[PDB]
Amino acid sequence: GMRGLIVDYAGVLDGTDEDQRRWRNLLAAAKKNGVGTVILSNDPGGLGAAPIRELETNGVVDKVLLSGELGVEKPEEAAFQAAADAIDLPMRDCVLVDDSILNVRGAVEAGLVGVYYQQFDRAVVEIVGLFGLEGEF
Ligand SMILES: [Ca+2]
Secondary structure (H helix, E strand, O other): OOOOEOOOOOOOOOOHHHHHHHHHHHHHHHHHHEEEEEEEEOOOOOOHHHHHHHHHHHHOOOOOEEEEHOOOOOOHHHHHHHHHHHOOOOOOHHEEEEOHHHHHHHHHHHEEEEEEOOOOOHHHHHHHHOOOOOOOO
């Protein structure tokens, strides 16, 4: 089943305080349902990405992967594969949420389920449905 949630950081998790609260609640619900969570970001990484990495350190997500550290970037299949590997799942069991249509299409082509993030209200319906989460997020 849909066991893995792979999300971008910039343009997805770094919005308004309201949007970030909504994402924190959604990720917490996903975690409680056993969903593995990875941030897969095209970002140079290193010290400058400490805000992103803190989300792994503090347990908000299971793992943070940054292209500048991986040596591969979205939409390359290898980037998605690394994310899936990080939470011990096949790519086919993962959902990618990303604000780049090219990244979402790349994911779908690799066998993931894709969700295009343009506004939280639209994307949340898809996410909640895919993972069978209960309540309004
Ligand atoms: Ca992005």
